[PDB]
Amino acid sequence: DWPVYHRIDGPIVMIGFGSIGRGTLPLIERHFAFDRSKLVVIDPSDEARKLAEARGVRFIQQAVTRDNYRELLVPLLTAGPGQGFCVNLSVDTSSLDIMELARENGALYIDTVVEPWLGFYFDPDLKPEARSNYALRETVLAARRNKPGGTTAVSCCGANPGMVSWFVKQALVNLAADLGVTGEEPTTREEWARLAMDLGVKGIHIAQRDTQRASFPKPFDVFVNTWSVEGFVSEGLQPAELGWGTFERWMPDNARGHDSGCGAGIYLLQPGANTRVRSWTPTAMAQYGFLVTHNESISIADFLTVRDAAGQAVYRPTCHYAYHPCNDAVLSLHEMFGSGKRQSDWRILDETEIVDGIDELGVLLYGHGKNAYWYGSQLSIEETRRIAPDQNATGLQVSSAVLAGMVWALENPNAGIVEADDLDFRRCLEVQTPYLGPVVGVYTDWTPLAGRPGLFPEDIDTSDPWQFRNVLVR
Amino acid sequence: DWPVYHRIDGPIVMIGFGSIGRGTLPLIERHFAFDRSKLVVIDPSDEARKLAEARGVRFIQQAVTRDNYRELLVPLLTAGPGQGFCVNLSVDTSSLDIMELARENGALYIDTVVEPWLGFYFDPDLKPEARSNYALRETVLAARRNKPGGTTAVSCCGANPGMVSWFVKQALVNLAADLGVTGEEPTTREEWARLAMDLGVKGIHIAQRDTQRASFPKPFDVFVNTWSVEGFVSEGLQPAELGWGTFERWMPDNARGHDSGCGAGIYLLQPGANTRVRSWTPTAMAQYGFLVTHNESISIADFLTVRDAAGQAVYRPTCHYAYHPCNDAVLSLHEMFGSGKRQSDWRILDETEIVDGIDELGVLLYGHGKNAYWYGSQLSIEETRRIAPDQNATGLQVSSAVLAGMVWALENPNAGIVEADDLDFRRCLEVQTPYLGPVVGVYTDWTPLAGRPGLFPEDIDTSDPWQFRNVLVR
Ligand SMILES: NC(=O)c1ccc[n+]([C@@H]2O[C@H](COP(=O)([O-])OP(=O)(O)OC[C@H]3O[C@@H](n4cnc5c(N)ncnc54)[C@H](O)[C@@H]3O)[C@@H](O)[C@H]2O)c1
Ligand SMILES: NC(=O)c1ccc[n+]([C@@H]2O[C@H](COP(=O)([O-])OP(=O)(O)OC[C@H]3O[C@@H](n4cnc5c(N)ncnc54)[C@H](O)[C@@H]3O)[C@@H](O)[C@H]2O)c1
Ligand SMILES: N=C(N)NCCCCN
Ligand SMILES: N=C(N)NCCCCN
Numbered sequence: 001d002w003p004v005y006h007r008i009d010g011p012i013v014m015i016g017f018g019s020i021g022r023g024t025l026p027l028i029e030r031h032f033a034f035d036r037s038k039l040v041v042i043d044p045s046d047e048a049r050k051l052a053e054a055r056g057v058r059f060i061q062q063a064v065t066r067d068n069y070r071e072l073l074v075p076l077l078t079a080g081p082g083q084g085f086c087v088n089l090s091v092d093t094s095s096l097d098i099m100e101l102a103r104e105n106g107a108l109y110i111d112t113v114v115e116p117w118l119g120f121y122f123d124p125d126l127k128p129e130a131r132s133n134y135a136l137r138e139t140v141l142a143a144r145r146n147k148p149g150g151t152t153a154v155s156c157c158g159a160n161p162g163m164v165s166w167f168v169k170q171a172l173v174n175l176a177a178d179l180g181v182t183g184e185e186p187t188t189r190e191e192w193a194r195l196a197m198d199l200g201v202k203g204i205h206i207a208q209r210d211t212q213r214a215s216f217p218k219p220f221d222v223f224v225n226t227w228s229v230e231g232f233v234s235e236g237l238q239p240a241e242l243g244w245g246t247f248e249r250w251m252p253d254n255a256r257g258h259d260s261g262c263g264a265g266i267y268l269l270q271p272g273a274n275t276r277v278r279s280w281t282p283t284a285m286a287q288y289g290f291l292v293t294h295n296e297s298i299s300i301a302d303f304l305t306v307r308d309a310a311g312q313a314v315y316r317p318t319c320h321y322a323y324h325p326c327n328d329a330v331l332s333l334h335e336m337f338g339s340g341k342r343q344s345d346w347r348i349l350d351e352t353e354i355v356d357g358i359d360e361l362g363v364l365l366y367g368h369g370k371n372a373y374w375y376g377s378q379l380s381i382e383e384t385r386r387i388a389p390d391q392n393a394t395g396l397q398v399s400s401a402v403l404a405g406m407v408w409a410l411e412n413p414n415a416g417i418v419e420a421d422d423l424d425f426r427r428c429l430e431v432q433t434p435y436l437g438p439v440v441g442v443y444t445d446w447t448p449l450a451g452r453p454g455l456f457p458e459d460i461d462t463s464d465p466w467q468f469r470n471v472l473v474r
Numbered sequence: 475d476w477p478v479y480h481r482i483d484g485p486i487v488m489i490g491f492g493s494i495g496r497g498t499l500p501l502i503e504r505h506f507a508f509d510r511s512k513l514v515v516i517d518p519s520d521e522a523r524k525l526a527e528a529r530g531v532r533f534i535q536q537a538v539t540r541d542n543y544r545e546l547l548v549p550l551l552t553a554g555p556g557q558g559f560c561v562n563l564s565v566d567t568s569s570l571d572i573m574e575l576a577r578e579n580g581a582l583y584i585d586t587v588v589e590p591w592l593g594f595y596f597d598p599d600l601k602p603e604a605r606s607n608y609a610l611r612e613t614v615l616a617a618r619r620n621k622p623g624g625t626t627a628v629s630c631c632g633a634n635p636g637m638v639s640w641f642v643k644q645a646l647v648n649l650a651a652d653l654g655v656t657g658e659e660p661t662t663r664e665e666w667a668r669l670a671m672d673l674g675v676k677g678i679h680i681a682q683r684d685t686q687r688a689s690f691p692k693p694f695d696v697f698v699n700t701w702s703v704e705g706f707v708s709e710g711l712q713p714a715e716l717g718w719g720t721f722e723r724w725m726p727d728n729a730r731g732h733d734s735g736c737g738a739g740i741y742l743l744q745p746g747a748n749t750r751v752r753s754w755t756p757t758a759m760a761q762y763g764f765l766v767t768h769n770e771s772i773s774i775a776d777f778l779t780v781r782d783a784a785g786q787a788v789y790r791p792t793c794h795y796a797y798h799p800c801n802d803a804v805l806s807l808h809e810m811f812g813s814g815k816r817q818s819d820w821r822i823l824d825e826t827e828i829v830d831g832i833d834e835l836g837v838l839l840y841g842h843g844k845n846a847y848w849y850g851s852q853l854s855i856e857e858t859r860r861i862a863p864d865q866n867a868t869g870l871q872v873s874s875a876v877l878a879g880m881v882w883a884l885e886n887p888n889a890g891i892v893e894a895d896d897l898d899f900r901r902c903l904e905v906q907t908p909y910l911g912p913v914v915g916v917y918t919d920w921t922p923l924a925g926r927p928g929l930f931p932e933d934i935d936t937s938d939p940w941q942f943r944n945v946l947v948r
Contacts, residue, residue: 128930213691217829218801220685237929269930278812288812324812327692327805334804338752338762340925355691451814455711456602456743 005431006410007033009082010107013073014041015064015098016090017048019227019348020112020158023391023399024089025055027435031403032410040076043090064093066117070101077107083151083413084108085406091230092118096139099153099417106151108409110402112158113231114140114295121234128239133293134258134265141262144417152415154423157405159361159397160206160321161296163432164376166425167363168204168300171375174441175199175368189303189421196304196317202247202367202466203318204300205277207374209284210326212357212381212392214349222345223336224328226359226394229346232292232325236273236333241293242266242468243301245318247367250461250469264301264316267293272321274337276473278448279322282374283360286446288473289322290333296420297321303421318468322364326357351392354381358437359393366466372444379437388435400435404428479905480884481507483556484581487547488515489538489572490564491522493701493822494586494632497865497873498563499529505877505905514550517564538567540591544575551581557625557887558582559880565704566592570613573627573891580625582883584876586632587705588614588769595708602713607767608732608739615736618891626889628897631879633835633871634680634795635770637906638850640899641837642678642774645849648915649673653843663777663895670778670791676721676841676940677792679751680770681848683758684800686831686855686866688823696819697810698802700833700868703820706799710747710807715767716740716942717775719792721841724935724943738775738790741767746795748811750947752922753796756848757834760920762947763796764807770894771795777895792942796838800831825866828855832911833867840940846918853911861909874909878902 012034014021021041028039041052044063052059064072077084086102088095088111095115102109114136121131129135140155156162172195173185179199186192212226223229244251244266254269268275272292279289297320306315324330326349336342362376379393388396401420408423408431409415415422433439447465452458459474461467486508488495495515503510515526518537526533536546551558558581562572568591576583588610594600603609614629630636646669647659655673660666686700697703718731718740728743742749746766753763771794780789798804800823810816836850853867862870875894882897882905883889889896907913921939926932933948935941 122929124929131929211694217687217691239930271930276812278814286813286815288808330805330808331801334762338750338798339760340752455596455598455605456713456745 002030004033005031005407008038008085008410010038010084011076011079012039012085012087013076014039014087014089015093016088017041017043017045017052018089019391019395020398020402021089022051023388023395024087024402025057026389027399027403028087028406042072064090064098066094066097069098073098073101074105077102078105087402087406089402091115091228095155096143099155100143103147103151103153108151108413109153110157110405110409111155112162112398112402113156121237128267128269129256129258131238132241132265132267133238133295134241134261134267134298137295137298138261140417149414149416152409152413153417154405154409155417155419156295156299157420158401160208161294161299162401162405162420163397164206164296164361164363165300165420166429167375168365169425170429171363171365171373171441172196172199172201174375175365175370175373179369190306193304193306193315197306197315200368201317201365203245205279205289205320205322205364205366206294206296207279207281207289207322207362207364209281209287209324209360210329210357210394211283212326212349212354212359212394214328214353215355216353218328218331221343222347223332223343224347224349225332226326226329226349226392227398229348232329233336233342235292235294236290237271238293240268240270240272240275240291241297242291242320243297243316243318245301246313246316247464248318248468249464250467252472262298262302263313264305265298273333277320277322277471278473279471280364280372280374280444280446281360281362282440282442283358283378284324286450287324289324292321292323294321299419299421349392351381351385354392357381357393359397361397370443372446373441374444375441377436377439383437396435400432404431407431476504478507479505479881482559482884483508484512484558485550485553486513487550487558487560488513489560489562489567491515491517491526492563493865493869494872494876495563496525497862497869498561498876499531500863501873501877502561502880538564538572540568540571543572547572547575548579551576551579561876561880563876565589565702565708569629570617573629574617577621577625577627582625582887583627584631584879584883585628586630586636586872586876588630595711602741602743603730603732605712606715606739606741607712607769608715608735608741608772611769611772612735614891623888623890626883626887627891628879628883629891629893630769630773631894632875634682635768635773636879636894637871637875638680638770638835638837639774639894640903641849642839643899644903645837645839645847645915646670646673646675648849649839649842649847667778667780667789671780671789674842675791675839677719678774678840679753679763679794679796679838680768681753681755681763681796681836681838683755683761683798683834684831684868685757686800686823686828686833686868688802688827689829690827692802692805695817696821697806697817698821698823699806700800700803700823700866701872703822706803707810707816709766709768710764711745712767713741714744714746714749714765715771716765716794717771717790717792719775720787720790721938722792722942724941726946736772736776737787738779739772747807751794751796751945752947753945754838754846754848754918754920755834755836756914756916757832757852758798760924761798763798766795766797768795773893773895823866825855825859828866831855833871835871844917846920847915848918849915851910851913857911870909874906878905881905
């Protein structure tokens with residue numbers, strides 16, 4: 001007896017049927033009312049076709065490209081009788097162009113990433129700045145400025161980016177309550193930003209530890225991951241990137257800012273998946289994470305910015321990813337960066353291939369009076385198998401966030417282009433929480449200066465343990 | 475059947491009965507003639523005691539310390555009737571002090587590391603220079619100058635240091651043939667150095683890839699290795715260290731030299747096991763190694779130094795370790811450095827736990843006319859189990875080098891303090907080769923600049939691919 005949240009009165013066009021599409025389709029079928037023949041999946045892969053045929057769903061074996069996307073998607077999204085929903089879970093497609101097409105035709109839209117057309121991430125004529133998620137996000141912000149309001153389109157609503165924006169709001173509320181600060185929670189963006197400022201939040205890690213492991217050892221010259229290998233390598237080869245807090249007093253020599261845009265970001269002239277940061281999760285305790293670029297690194301810092309009358313930022317948290325992937329992915333990164341090139345083969349771990357483990361994913365708020373607070377999900381593979389098919393624990397955190405964004409978009413269908421920071425976080429977490437396993441908040445007295453300095457000289461700032469100077473591995 | 479090289483008539487005193495002692499004792503029993511009652515094993519651990527008793531060998535459950543080593547060891551070393559052999563395969567004991575005791579009492583000596591007394595590797599008042607293997611080795615060189623000749627003591631005769639010195643000589647021979655350099659095979663240190671210089675060898679990696687893996691996955695908060703965890707962690711937390719070649723044109727800002735000594739070394743003010751270098755082996759192809767300090771990095775560069783009349787070095791190869799350990803040790807390093815402290819538990823993989831894999835261990839000579847040449851052993855666990863008990867492939871490469879060193883010392887018992895570079899490499903390899911599996915030379919066109927510059931600006935030296943500037947990972 002699962003809740004059916006809404007009737008969808010139009011076509012459901014799912015672009016992409018890899019690990020996330022495969023975990024999202026059963027949730028869509030479970031939680032929305034629609035005639036089954038309204039749903040069609042689009043993916044160029046033979047593997048995806050065979051799985052879709054086995055699930056009995058309509059399947060169009062085609063790559064969506066700049067040359068064909070209008071021809072293909074417009075008729076599919078406007079088949080009627082009412083408003084359709086474009087669920088974009090693909091690689092190599094332009095989120096912006098597909099979102100703008102959906103909106104022009106009155107269809108709802110959701111995705112989990114601001115993705116460019118094939119050919120972008122490895123174009124040699126591009127500067128590192130132009131390869132940054134800040135630059136991609138700015139194309140979406142400009143599209144919203146050019147066409148405000150209109151049909152709801154939800155950008156970057158997966159686990160991270162996505163759910164972690166809701167966790168930040170919940171964590172801020174909890175931090176205030178744990179101090180005895182009572183009174184209504186924020187309702188506006190400015191109020192959220194000021195809550196973070198008033199609590200003294202210096203920054204936020206998206207602090208993740210994947211402990212899922214397979215029944216076979218990592219094969220030589222095979223990249224192994226629990227979600228998209230292509231997508232992980234793409235973002236891992238983008239510049240390291242972070243939302244940049246007002247409290248930071250140091251940045252590396254190879255860090256750069258941006259001439260234009262929301263003002264919240266810096267990037268480093270080095271690949272994020274080969275950049276390490278010191279961080280912490282409840283199961284990992286102190287660990288290395290990789291400083292992989294993510295939309296929410298910028299979007300959360302932007303959302304939580306307090307400006308003065310003249311428009312300059314007076315407060316902004318640091319925000320970035322601190323990702324410890326599954327052990328086989330750690331080894332895959334060591335192998336890829338060590339060989340200088342991508343492995344000849346790759347595979348994504350299926351739930352049938354996973355022996356145990358969890359995907360621990362939350363937000364680590366630091367610098368406040370209780371030093372650091374981690375809030376998020378500790379979903380295990382064992383629980384995943386019991387509550388949702390066709391995915392591992394990493395996949396279910398993502399697919400259930402897409403579900404929640406879809407509920408929100410159907411309930412708020414005239415909201416325009418929105419990010420996860422713009423949604424009603426309580427409504428979204430109400431939809432998502434049945435799929436998140438243990439959701440817990442944990443304080444720690446760990447800081448990045450724990451145990452330091454050691455037996456070698458280090459450049460550290462002992463007056464401010466959470467300075468990026470102390471977090472970055474150098 | 476197996477050759478019995480010599481009769482040993484005196485006591486055989488084995489200090490330490492861990493992974494290497496366990497592998498070396500059966501080879502000693504196989505290849506030397508002696509009454510088993512003349513063996514004596516000294517180790518503080520109960521695990522060692524149970525193993526020794528199972529072998530029916532005399533056992534003393536003591537830790538050898540600065541306070542007790544003269545009182546404990548002299549009666550054992552001088553028990554007669556003949557000359558004794560002290561086989562030191564321990565941790566936390568002073569190689570130098572035990573070696574000098576053995577020589578003072580007419581006993582032969584062999585070890586696989588210049589180890590200091592307990593307390594040194596983590597004394598907070600030691601400057602980084604004093605923690606280097608260069609400095610430890612200089613204490614051995616000083617002892618030789620103080621007491622030339624005398625009873626043979628073989629310093630650092632394992633797989634690496636040890637065997638790889640013999641691989642360097644064989645590789646120089648092979649390169650000379652292949653490049654058409656004419657001349658007699660060297661027979662003195664000065665002739666070997668001149669051969670390296672005439673061949674244009676800019677440098678040498680001790681290039682190693684361990685692919686052994688266990689039937690169980692890496693446990694959380696357990697350091698896993700194929701040999702000493704204590705020993706590996708100790709050397710991994712010493713400064714990164716290398717023999718410094720005359721061709722190098724750049725050193726990092728945190729590199730330092732030495733005021734005194736043989737002059738062949740630099741060290742970096744960072745731990746070697748968290749320092750990566752670009753390297754290459756036949757099985758791994760291009761890979762990261764860790765720049766872990768090792769005696770042979772100095773000893774080989776020193777041995778192959780050519781000087782002019784003024785005693786100034788005019789040629790010297792760069793030489794250093796480029797270690798890719800087994801996958802579980804790679805994960806163990808990521809865990810240890812990421813948490814800032816040693817794991818609470820550790821284990822050494824036993825042959826009964828290893829499912830497959832090899833220990834590929836060789837020397838990569840580079841900068842000559844055929845770019846780079848790797849020469850070494852590709853010993854598999856399957857072959858190891860066929861030919862020797864109680865050890866894995868890593869251990870067998872070490873124990874068989876100790877065996878070769880012992881045979882050499884018996885045939886040359888009044889040669890004074892010697893390193894592996896000073897032994898007759900052909901006799902040593904004649905004893906060792908039955909235990910090395912495939913031993914092969916391979917050329918490659920790979921260089922550290924393959925694929926570079928990439929998508930981000932890099933500080934590289936395009937005039938000479940093999941510069942340390944291009945090898946070191948920043
Ligand atoms: N939390 C998050 O926000 C989050 C998490 C995971 C993944 N993602 C993103 O979601 C997307 C999918 O992840 P995944 O794990 O399912 O990836 P995946 O690699 O498993 O699958 C991607 C699918 O896209 C298909 N595809 C490729 N080119 C296409 C085209 N032109 N048109 C249509 N389909 C095409 C592929 O055939 C493949 O099946 C990725 O972009 C990834 O970066 C976001
Ligand atoms: N190729 C090489 O040159 C090479 C390779 C492997 C190991 N090694 C060195 O050989 C040594 C042994 O390696 P391992 O793998 O056998 O190590 P291990 O950790 O397995 O064993 C070390 C043994 O020494 C014993 N020990 C500790 N303190 C002692 C003391 N005070 N007196 C006597 N014994 C003591 C321990 O109880 C243990 O059994 C280490 O020093 C290691 O660095 C060299
Ligand atoms: N989320 C922000 N950064 N700003 C608020 C944008 C609100 C869009 N309706
Ligand atoms: N190996 C050296 N570096 N020098 C040679 C010294 C000879 C010792 N009997």
